[PDB]
Design a protein around this ligand. Structure first.
Ligand code: 3SP
Lengths: 31, 250, 10
């Protein structure tokens, strides 16, 4: 749609369902 | 980046390096938004006060990098610029208003584990994520302190700051096309972008669809990581229509 | 900085 499908999904993380060292810090701040 | 840390491999597959042909040196950060388009700050290409006015042939874009100085053979990819587009109302005279530019790559870049485009926000995502307190991530190979440089890509997580607080921290007239981020003096933690990080992406991970979106671009600041001061970024969504126009007609 | 291969300089 407003963004070409597949964008924003990192090959070495989201696509393997692995998380990076601090991405949790961002999500926890989204109240 | 000041007070940041080493990014892990493939953590920012959209991170782009603006490299100068001669003398060979880091010029700015940027980001990949599709296989042919790169987004960056306009002051990276044009800024008369410092006699800065680059053309398509003065630059090279290096995608998929980690190390700042090494030519990461078989990993990174170097592309040439076909055309550059600065926002018609970019204000370098007063306050770097509309500090944004699009660069068209001569040939499409092939995606891989270290090269992948970040998403461009739509109205719903911007309204939902662009809120004071919500943290974003900035990346770059810029200076580590106020002027020294890092060996690998630096990353730092910073919270978006209320517009009023941003306004009362400088004498520079801020506009709706920009926002600021950083920790306040009493929040304990610190961190900021710095010289060299210009054009770098400010991204947020959507909790709704798990995709990474680029909300801002490293634009300007006064010093680096100074208490009471905040980094300013170009508001990407506010300029989305100009971005779409340029891409659909060119 | 480490030298970039020549064929990109064109
Ligand atoms: N603390 C930060 N987040 C950042 C600090 C420097 C950044 C790169 N931008 C720039 O250097 C841009 C390019 C033109 C002058 N810039 C600056 O950031 C200038 C302030 C600028 C404000 C708008 C009107 C022209 C003067 N400060 C330089 C400094 O304090 O080192 S980002």
């Amino acid at each position: 749609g407003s963004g070409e499908a597949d964008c924003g999904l990192r090959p070495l993380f989201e696509k393997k369902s692995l998380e990076d060292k601090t991405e949790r810090e961002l999500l926890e701040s989204y109240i | 980046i000041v007070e940041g840390s080493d990014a892990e491999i493939g953590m920012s597959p959209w991170q782009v390096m603006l490299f100068r042909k001669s003398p060979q040196e880091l010029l700015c950060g940027a980001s990949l938004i599709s296989d042919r388009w790169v987004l960056t700050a306009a002051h990276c290409l044009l800024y008369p006060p410092w006699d800065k006015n680059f053309t398509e042939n003065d630059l090279l874009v290096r995608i998929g990098k980690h190390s700042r100085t090494r030519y990461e053979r078989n990993i990174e990819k170097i592309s040439m610029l076909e055309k550059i587009y600065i926002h018609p109302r970019y204000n370098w005279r007063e306050n770097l208003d509309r500090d944004i530019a699009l660069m068209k790559l001569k040939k499409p870049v092939a995606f891989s584990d270290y090269i992948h485009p970040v998403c461009l926000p739509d109205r719903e995502t911007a309204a939902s994520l662009l809120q004071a307190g919500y943290k974003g991530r900035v990346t770059g190979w810029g200076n580590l302190k106020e002027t020294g440089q890092p060996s690998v890509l630096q990353v730092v997580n910073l919270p978006i700051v209320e517009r009023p607080v941003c306004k009362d921290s400088t004498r520079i007239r801020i506009t709706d096309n920009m926002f600021c981020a950083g920790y306040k003096p009493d929040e304990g933690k610190r961190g900021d972008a710095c010289e060299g990080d210009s054009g770098g992406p400010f991204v947020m991970k959507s909790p709704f669809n798990n995709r990474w979106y680029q909300m801002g671009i490293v634009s300007w600041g006064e010093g680096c990581d100074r208490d009471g001061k905040y980094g300013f970024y170009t508001h990407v969504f506010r300029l989305k229509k100009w971005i779409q126009k340029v891409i659909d007609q060119f | 900085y480490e030298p970039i291969p020549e064929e990109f300089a064109q």
